[PDB]
Amino acid sequence: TTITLNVLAWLYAAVINGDRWFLNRFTTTLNDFNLVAMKYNYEPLTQDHVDILGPLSAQTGIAVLDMCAALKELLQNGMNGRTILGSTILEDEFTPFDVVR
Amino acid sequence: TTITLNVLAWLYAAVINGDRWFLNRFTTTLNDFNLVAMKYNYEPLTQDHVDILGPLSAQTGIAVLDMCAALKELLQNGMNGRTILGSTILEDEFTPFDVV
Numbered sequence: 001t002t003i004t005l006n007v008l009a010w011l012y013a014a015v016i017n018g019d020r021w022f023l024n025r026f027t028t029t030l031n032d033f034n035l036v037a038m039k040y041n042y043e044p045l046t047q048d049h050v051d052i053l054g055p056l057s058a059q060t061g062i063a064v065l066d067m068c069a070a071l072k073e074l075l076q077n078g079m080n081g082r083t084i085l086g087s088t089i090l091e092d093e094f095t096p097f098d099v100v101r
Numbered sequence: 102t103t104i105t106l107n108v109l110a111w112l113y114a115a116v117i118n119g120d121r122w123f124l125n126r127f128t129t130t131l132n133d134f135n136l137v138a139m140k141y142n143y144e145p146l147t148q149d150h151v152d153i154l155g156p157l158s159a160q161t162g163i164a165v166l167d168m169c170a171a172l173k174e175l176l177q178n179g180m181n182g183r184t185i186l187g188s189t190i191l192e193d194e195f196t197p198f199d200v201v
Contacts, residue, residue: 002143004172005150006193011168012157013200014186021183022171023163025124042103049106056113062124067109070123076178082122085115092107099114 028069036072055100129170137173154197 011022034044050064057064074090084090112123135145146169154165175191185191 002141002191003193003196004138004143004146005153006196007143007191008146008150008154008165008168008172009157009197009200010192010195011172011185012154012161012163012197013195015161015163016157016200017186019185022175022185023126023167025126026181037105040103042105042108045105045109049109052106053109053113056110056117060113060116062113062116064109066124067112071105071109071112074123077127077174080127084112084120084123085118090103090108091111092104094111094114095104095107096110098107099110099117 025066025073026069027063027066028072029065030068033065033068033072036075040075042075052096056096126167127170127174128164128167129173131166131169134166134169134173137176141176143176156201157197 011019015023030045030047030050037044045068053064053067057067071090079088079090112120116124131146131148131151138145151165154168158165158168172191180189180191
């Protein structure tokens with residue numbers, strides 16, 4: 001069996017020696033995001049879509065692709081009892097134009 | 102089909118209204134970590150193990166359970182071509198005392 005204690009000790013050694021990526025959020029590319037988006041029957045995201053979300057990205061300071069990595073995560077790991085704006089589900093009934101209002 | 106553009110717009114709405122959790126890390130319970138660990142044939146982590154790692158946690162400034170969440174994430178989503186200390190796999194040949 002894999003000794004978890006050791007693996008954790010090793011990760012700590014990695015950090016002591018300079019590693020940081022596995023501690024931060026990963027981000028993603030449009031293409032990688034879509035590979036995931038498709039496993040869960042989500043409409044593929046186009047470059048246009050990405051560019052169309054710029055207003056909201058400028059208003060929040062959160063790069064669009066960074067928000068995509070967040071969605072990617074929720075899709076793979078779930079919300080785990082946590083909600084978003086009080087919802088237990090990811091809402092898709094509101095458009096960009098809707099939210100910007 | 103689920104409109105991705107709309108879902109992303111919603112998350113931004115959520116951020117605009119104060120949401121943050123889905124942007125930052127996700128710490129973990131020793132229990133939740135173990136449910137995940139066993140899924141991948143890893144030794145379950147005990148409270149002793151956690152406490153034994155305190156020296157390294159103090160030297161790095163990153164809590165044990167936070168490192169556990171990091172591991173949890175690596176096991177569920179993989180390393181994706183990225184490496185750790187040059188290795189392409191999660192090494193478990195070194196004990197806490199080997200690292201110290």
